[PDB]
Amino acid sequence: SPIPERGDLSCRMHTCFDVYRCGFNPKNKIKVYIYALISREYNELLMAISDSDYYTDDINRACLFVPSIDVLNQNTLRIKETAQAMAQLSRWDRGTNHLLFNMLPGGPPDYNTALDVPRDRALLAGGGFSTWTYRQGYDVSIPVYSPLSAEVDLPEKGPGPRQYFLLSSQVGLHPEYREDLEALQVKHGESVLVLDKRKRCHKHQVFDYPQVLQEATFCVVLRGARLGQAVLSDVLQAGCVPVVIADSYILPFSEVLDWKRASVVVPEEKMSDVYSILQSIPQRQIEEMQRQARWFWEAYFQSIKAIALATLQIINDRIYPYAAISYEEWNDPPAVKWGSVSNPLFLPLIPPQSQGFTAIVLTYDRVESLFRVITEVSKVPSLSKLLVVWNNQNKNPPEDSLWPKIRVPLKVVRTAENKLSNRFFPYDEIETEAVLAIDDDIIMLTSDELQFGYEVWREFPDRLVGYPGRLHLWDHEMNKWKYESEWTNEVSMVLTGAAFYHKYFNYLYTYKMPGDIKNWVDAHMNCEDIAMNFLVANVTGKAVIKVTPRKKFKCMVERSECINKFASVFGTMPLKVVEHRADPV
Amino acid sequence: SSIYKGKKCRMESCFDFTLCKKNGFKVYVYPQQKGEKIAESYQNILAAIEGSRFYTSDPSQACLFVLSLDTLDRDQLSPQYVHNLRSKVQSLHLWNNGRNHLIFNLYSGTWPDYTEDVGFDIGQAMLAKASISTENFRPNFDVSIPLFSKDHPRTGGERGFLKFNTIPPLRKYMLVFKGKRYLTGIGSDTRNALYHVHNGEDVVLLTTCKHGKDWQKHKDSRCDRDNTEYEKYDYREMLHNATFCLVPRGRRLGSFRFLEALQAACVPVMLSNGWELPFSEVINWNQAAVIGDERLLLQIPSTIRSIHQDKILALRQQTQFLWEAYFSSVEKIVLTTLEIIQDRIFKHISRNSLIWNKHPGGLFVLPQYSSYLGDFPYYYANLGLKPPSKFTAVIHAVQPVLKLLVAAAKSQYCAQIIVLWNSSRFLPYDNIITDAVLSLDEDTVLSTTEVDFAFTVWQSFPERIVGYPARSHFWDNSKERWGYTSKWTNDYSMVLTGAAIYHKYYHYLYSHYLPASLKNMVDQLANCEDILMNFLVSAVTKLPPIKVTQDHFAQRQSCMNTFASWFGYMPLIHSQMRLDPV
Ligand SMILES: *[C@@H]1O[C@H](CO)[C@@H](O[C@@H]2O[C@H](CO)[C@@H](O[C@@H]3O[C@H](CO)[C@@H](O)[C@H](O)[C@@H]3O)[C@H](O)[C@H]2NC(C)=O)[C@H](O)[C@H]1NC(C)=O
Numbered sequence A: 001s002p003i004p005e006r007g008d009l010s011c012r013m014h015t016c017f018d019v020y021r022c023g024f025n026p027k028n029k030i031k032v033y034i035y036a037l038i039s040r041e042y043n044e045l046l047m048a049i050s051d052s053d054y055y056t057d058d059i060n061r062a063c064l065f066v067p068s069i070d071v072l073n074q075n076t077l078r079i080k081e082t083a084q085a086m087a088q089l090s091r092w093d094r095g096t097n098h099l100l101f102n103m104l105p106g107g108p109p110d111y112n113t114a115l116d117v118p119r120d121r122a123l124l125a126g127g128g129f130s131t132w133t134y135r136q137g138y139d140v141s142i143p144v145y146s147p148l149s150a151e152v153d154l155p156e157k158g159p160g161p162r163q164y165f166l167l168s169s170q171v172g173l174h175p176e177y178r179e180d181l182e183a184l185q186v187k188h189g190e191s192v193l194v195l196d197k198r199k200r201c202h203k204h205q206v207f208d209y210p211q212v213l214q215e216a217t218f219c220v221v222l223r224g225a226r227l228g229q230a231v232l233s234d235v236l237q238a239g240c241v242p243v244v245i246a247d248s249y250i251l252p253f254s255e256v257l258d259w260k261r262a263s264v265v266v267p268e269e270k271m272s273d274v275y276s277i278l279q280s281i282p283q284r285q286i287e288e289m290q291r292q293a294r295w296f297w298e299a300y301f302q303s304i305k306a307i308a309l310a311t312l313q314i315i316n317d318r319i320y321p322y323a324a325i326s327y328e329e330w331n332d333p334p335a336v337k338w339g340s341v342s343n344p345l346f347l348p349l350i351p352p353q354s355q356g357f358t359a360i361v362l363t364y365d366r367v368e369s370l371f372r373v374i375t376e377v378s379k380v381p382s383l384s385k386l387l388v389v390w391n392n393q394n395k396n397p398p399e400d401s402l403w404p405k406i407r408v409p410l411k412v413v414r415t416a417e418n419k420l421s422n423r424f425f426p427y428d429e430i431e432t433e434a435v436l437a438i439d440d441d442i443i444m445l446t447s448d449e450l451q452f453g454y455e456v457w458r459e460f461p462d463r464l465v466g467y468p469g470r471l472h473l474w475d476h477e478m479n480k481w482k483y484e485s486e487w488t489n490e491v492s493m494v495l496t497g498a499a500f501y502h503k504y505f506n507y508l509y510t511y512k513m514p515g516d517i518k519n520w521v522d523a524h525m526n527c528e529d530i531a532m533n534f535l536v537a538n539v540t541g542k543a544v545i546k547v548t549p550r551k552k553f554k555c556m557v558e559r560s561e562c563i564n565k566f567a568s569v570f571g572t573m574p575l576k577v578v579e580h581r582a583d584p585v
Numbered sequence B: 001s002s003i004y005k006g007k008k009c010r011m012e013s014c015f016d017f018t019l020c021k022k023n024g025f026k027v028y029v030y031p032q033q034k035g036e037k038i039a040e041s042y043q044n045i046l047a048a049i050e051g052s053r054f055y056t057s058d059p060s061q062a063c064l065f066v067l068s069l070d071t072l073d074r075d076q077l078s079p080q081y082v083h084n085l086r087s088k089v090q091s092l093h094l095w096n097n098g099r100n101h102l103i104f105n106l107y108s109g110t111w112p113d114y115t116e117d118v119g120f121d122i123g124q125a126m127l128a129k130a131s132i133s134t135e136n137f138r139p140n141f142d143v144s145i146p147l148f149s150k151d152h153p154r155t156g157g158e159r160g161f162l163k164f165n166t167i168p169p170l171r172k173y174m175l176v177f178k179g180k181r182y183l184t185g186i187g188s189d190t191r192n193a194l195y196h197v198h199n200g201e202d203v204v205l206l207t208t209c210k211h212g213k214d215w216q217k218h219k220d221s222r223c224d225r226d227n228t229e230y231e232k233y234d235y236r237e238m239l240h241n242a243t244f245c246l247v248p249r250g251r252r253l254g255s256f257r258f259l260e261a262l263q264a265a266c267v268p269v270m271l272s273n274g275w276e277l278p279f280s281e282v283i284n285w286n287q288a289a290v291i292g293d294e295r296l297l298l299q300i301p302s303t304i305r306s307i308h309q310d311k312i313l314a315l316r317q318q319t320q321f322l323w324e325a326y327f328s329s330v331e332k333i334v335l336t337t338l339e340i341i342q343d344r345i346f347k348h349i350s351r352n353s354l355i356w357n358k359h360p361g362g363l364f365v366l367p368q369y370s371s372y373l374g375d376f377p378y379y380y381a382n383l384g385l386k387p388p389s390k391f392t393a394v395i396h397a398v399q400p401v402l403k404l405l406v407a408a409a410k411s412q413y414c415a416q417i418i419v420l421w422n423s424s425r426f427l428p429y430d431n432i433i434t435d436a437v438l439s440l441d442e443d444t445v446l447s448t449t450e451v452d453f454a455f456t457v458w459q460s461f462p463e464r465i466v467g468y469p470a471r472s473h474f475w476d477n478s479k480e481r482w483g484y485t486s487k488w489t490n491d492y493s494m495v496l497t498g499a500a501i502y503h504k505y506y507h508y509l510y511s512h513y514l515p516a517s518l519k520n521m522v523d524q525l526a527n528c529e530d531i532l533m534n535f536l537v538s539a540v541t542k543l544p545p546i547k548v549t550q551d552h553f554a555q556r557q558s559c560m561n562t563f564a565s566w567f568g569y570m571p572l573i574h575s576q577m578r579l580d581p582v
């Protein structure tokens, strides 16, 4: 039987992977094929592949290949037989696009730190990788799965102080490691505990292996075999921060996972100084590392399904980097993911005064007051364009002759329906960044006030700037939010009437806001400003700027209900309370 | 270790951590022989190195070496090639097979089959070559650096081009290119097939075969039309009116167009297959650029169109940030490479994948202070932690102080008060527990409620300096020098640290990032510390400070001029608001 050539370490995606097979598609997902015919672990892996969106049929159309040969353990691999099987696969095609799964890539006499099969060009997902046996952009570093993750349901203990500081629960350490561990234990004592030989025994003391790891804030993983030990998964499940002492080892899924916030890597030469550098890490960093360790287990190390999904996602992001998922979605815990902001306007840019603001005036059944405000708005410098939106279909727009004479290009848009949220639609007529939403009843603003508001918005293009001042309070008697405007000691919202904000907020309101809020706010014809404030504070995670020491500008239960519903839909209340306002220097 | 002492060197085998001790990582520059021709860019690199705090004069103390010989250009036909370099590098006394030697290279190979030909045997020395193929790249030993021209700024910055983030971010064109195509040779395959996908409305691609003798010798049936089309659109106009920019492979994998595309904020679409993008192992390029495969050149425009508008906005903004943080000047590139090397010494003291790919960048974030993201003021929003509720008061003294101390202590957010008795106000102190530092001068009256308001304002803007005394800057056309304004104007760009609040990390940044010369000048003149503090804050944050309410003078101008000379530009941004309580 033919045998392919040995593992070509000089094999990368741009020379090995056949990108023609999976070129492009609207749903940027790689299609993986399952070969017809075995450990239970590989069976779970194949079921996970087949029960996901990556699985397809019609082999000639699929992109990835995962042969159905149990290669996970190399101790009973029969290297020659595996090579003969992969050659007899009859669809190898020199192994340009085939994926192999492994967790124990080591041999009895020598630890090659990689699969010993020929595997001339196949993409390998292995457990034990050294920097010399790992192809950077080609191979995927996957963890070795310990069945204890499913055999025992260790309780989800929260971060906090623990009885032990450093722990080392492994069986079979070489004397060079055990001697140093004993020396450290006798040097410090009562914090380091070393456990000797699914049960752990100390000197005249017995500990259960899964649960003893919960009492230590650190756990130490050595390199004894294949460079990758299953103790890492148990260490991460228990929550204790791993301390990898392996010399040249890349942690699993290091391509996307930020192992610096979840694990500590210490060289084997400086093993006697492990405790000294472990004292350097502060307690709150310990808490973060414990949370990251727990999240990495509950998502990538809990089951074979998680490992397979993560590996397929790695390969998919490599093949389609433009549609690749974000760093946070990879390695942010769900609690922090809810707490994360990820502001869409993240450049600290200040636009100059060359452009201006496109003022948008919402009008319906009010023309005598519209002129009084449009005349004042036109007098404001740096007004590039002014759009009047006509929500009223029953009435006809006034003739062009009677419109006031202004130096700014004016445009009147005839709406199809009468929706108060139509002021926030992103029109193609805005050629600028700043958009001034000004209401008809708003008359008590000078041109200087509008100019200063635009100038202040120049310093903060990523948030929403408005003149009116409102906030929110908590009432214990009703146990609900309330809308307060009579007194102003803090500000949490500014009404969209007389507000400077970036047009991306208009786009967000029109498209990316949840559909439950836009339709409801259109139906009740109130609290559009509250919805915009909520959305801006949610997407930017930043406060709001009031730019005038005045309250009256135009010459409660419903809004409280609006606030309560907006809090309910979001799952929390994104608004932030601040007491700083901007006025001329 | 001995087995992998070749092209397979990594830092655990072909590197010596013993020389780097703990507070080390010093860089030694070989002295000039005063008998060799050297290109201007190499003077720029060594000026960046010797101007950094990693520079040292004693070879024994240093654990990193950089050669004095011009190794940037290794092409034999190039005017800047240095002959007999192989035998010359072995004559150095401190070579030691290049155990801790860093080599900067921008070109390699001759006209036929450009390859990894540095000429001299590097041995154990890691090379920071610009165009490194993926299969020829050491995963954690070498560094991929950008390819830049001799006119690239040494210390200054061009401040990008994108002044308006207009929505939609789409522009007149979508996918543009204006570059030479090569009739014969290697590396023109991606370039000669651009006419297949050329459209003329959105995908406009331009090529010419005018590259010397072959202008009319071996021209194909398309050079005439290509040249006629080439002479209509400006390159600084179509690059600035494009959503996406192509950066294909020519003779070499890298090109100058990449940095210019980041300069123009247009999202690069790389076609150079197997190119280690500059700092690929340290910077995520899926966040600032679209990586395409030249094999599927025809299907590129559909993928470009399929990219969502929000994705385009994020890519454009990240491209601008990357250019302005790492690729703006040669000094930035050199310090980025040096810090990337440093991060691999202590695996528990280094920057994570989020610091490099987020504001302000790795150059201004020093992990020696702390590797915890919450110990910095730049990452509160990215994580889910509020800014610290307690602040530490630092008072420097050389009575009003007795009344001042009581007022500052009565604050509900005040944890402890430190009194300094004698530029020492900016050194880090282990006695400071809180992450917020209130630097207060002995002669500045500051009320308790005023302190509370200042701290609450700082809580909303932790990255900046919140302070009451504010001063402005101006430009003098009579003397072509920067000026200092102490008078009330309707503008300001600096806030004095005498009554200001800032994060504790700025102390460490001032002490371990700015070089000794500036602080020595500050000490000799006995002023100008707060001006440089504001310069550093405005450089790191790229935002103006926030002012809140409710013979010596001639030295300030010289201080500002020399700080501007060192920085190379204006970190200062003029500000025109004033936050007040409601
Ligand atoms: C910005 O708005 C988003 C909503 O689009 C907020 O995300 C939401 O955050 C809440 C918690 O604050 C999540 O509620 C949680 O739901 C899980 C079940 O999924 C439940 O087990 C928890 O006990 C909790 O109730 C909610 O799921 C989440 N929704 C989404 C779509 O992410 C986000 O928190 C807002 N940001 C700010 C700063 O307010």
Ligand SMILES: O=c1ccn([C@@H]2O[C@H](COP(=O)(O)OP(=O)(O)O)[C@@H](O)[C@H]2O)c(=O)[nH]1
Pocket (backbone or CB within 6 Å): B178, B179, B180, B181, B235, B249, B250, B251, B255, B256, B257, B260
């Ligand atoms: O019409 C042009 C063509 C090129 N360049 C500049 O020349 C360099 C690119 O050179 P070239 O296209 O020859 O690169 P290659 O084709 O050799 O890869 C960049 O700095 C461009 O800004 C330019 O300014 N105008």
